[PDB]
Amino acid sequence: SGFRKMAFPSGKVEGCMVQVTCGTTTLNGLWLDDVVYCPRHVICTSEDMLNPNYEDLLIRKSNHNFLVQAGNVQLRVIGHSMQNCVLKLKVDTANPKTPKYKFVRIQPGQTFSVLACYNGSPSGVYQCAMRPNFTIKGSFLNGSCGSVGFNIDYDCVSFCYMHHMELPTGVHAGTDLEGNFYGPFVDRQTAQAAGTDTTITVNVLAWLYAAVINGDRWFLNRFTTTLNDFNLVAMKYNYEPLTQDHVDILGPLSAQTGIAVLDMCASLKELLQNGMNGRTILGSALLEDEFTPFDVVRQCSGVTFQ
């Protein structure tokens, strides 16, 4: 019993965090094998923030401009290359702590654990979702750039996020580990705003299944709904459209609880139209949308990682 925003165990990633200093900029890098990945705006200065030509900026760099600290051991950069918005610093030492890992570009709606770091030292771990507007509602201060988001699958760390910047609304934007921003954002200080976000409907439904698995039933009802009539209601309340693929993905949870997906949709419909009327679901007074169907099954069933 119980349901918590659960992050993956972070140790496999902690072992990869390093400090990258270039000029007056310090941020975090991800040390996998003999490469340190970090946001390319590490090669920018206080005047370089605005409209930088990173190819120009980078050819003016030498390897010894890049100060990579792995704890209390200075790593020597022997080469560098820029891939989209990530800098790849080739170092002379392979990280002996390199986990089995993949780089994955996730879809919006997908969740991940963020290992927040400063000066290459992990500070905290929390679960985020990639919002539909490709921002993440993170917790990031100055120096957190290069902190990564990740999922773990048995023994394999799937890195999916590297932190680059905070938008004026206080949400966060970054890239996959191959340096491609999530969303329309660019790594240059110009007018950029998040764009209107929407609620991740399939995740809300998953969490409603989590609630039923855990003994909250007060929100269930007799009614059912069609996928279209649900989506017409979702529509109004700024909810992401629910697709048939979403429905299928919610299959196991529907099968475990005996609640047809569209029945749960009928329940969410009435939740959207009636509020919760002073009640809570899984300790929340809001409809929670940062658990995927996978998240619910993993935590309500006990999947682990070796």
Ligand X SMILES: *[C@H](O)[C@H](C[C@@H]1CCNC1=O)NC(=O)[C@H](CC1CCCCC1)NC(=O)[C@@H](NC(=O)OCC1CC1)[C@@H](C)OC(C)(C)C
DSSP code at position 200: -
What length is written for the chain? 306
Residues 163-192 that bind ligand X (CB under 6 A): 164-168, 172, 187-190, 192
Number of other residues whose CB lies within 10 A of the CB of residue 306: 4
For the bound state, the minimum distance from the C-beta of residue 185 to ligand X, rounded and expressed in Å, comes to 7
| 277 binding partner (options ligand X, its own copies, none; Cβ < 5 to 8 Å by kind) | none
Residues 93-152 that bind ligand X (CB under 6 A): 140-145
Between 54 and 239, name the residue whose CB sits nearer to its own copies.
239
| Type of residue found at 174 | G
Q: What are phi and psi of 166, to 5 degrees?
A: -110, 135
| 117 binding partner (options ligand X, its own copies, none; Cβ < 5 to 8 Å by kind) | its own copies
Binding mask 254-283 for ligand X (x = CB under 6 A): ------------------------------
51 contributes a contact to ligand X by CB under 6 A: no
Rounded distance between C-alpha atoms, residue 269 and residue 185, angstroms = 33
Size of site (CB under 8 A) for its own copies: 55
| 6 binding partner (options its own copies, ligand X, none; Cβ < 5 to 8 Å by kind) | its own copies
| Interstrand relation of 156-166 and 100-103 (parallel, antiparallel or unpaired) | parallel
For the bound state, the minimum distance from the C-beta of residue 144 to ligand X, rounded and expressed in Å, comes to 5
Place of tokens 């929670």: 288
Between 30 and 247, name the residue whose CB sits nearer to its own copies.
30
Q: What are phi and psi of 227, to 5 degrees?
A: -60, -40
For the bound state, the minimum distance from the C-beta of residue 136 to its own copies, rounded and expressed in Å, comes to 9
Between 79 and 283, name the residue whose CB sits nearer to its own copies.
283
| Angle (nearest 5°) at CA 87 between 54 and 151 | 135
Residues 215-234 that bind its own copies (CB under 8 A): 215
Please name which of 108, 114, 106 lies closest in space to residue 133, comparing C-alpha atoms: 108
| 188 binding partner (options its own copies, ligand X, none; Cβ < 5 to 8 Å by kind) | ligand X
DSSP 83-95: ETTEEEEEESS--
Bridge partners (DSSP) of residue 175 are 162, 181
Q: Which residues contact 241 (CB under 8 A, 6 or more apart)?
A: 201, 231, 234, 235
| Residues after which a C–N gap over 2.5 Å breaks the chain | none
Position among 51, 142, 196, 244 found at the interface with its own copies (CB under 8 A): 142
Q: Which residues bind ligand X (CB under 6 A)?
A: 1, 27, 41, 44, 49, 140-145, 164-168, 172, 187-190, 192
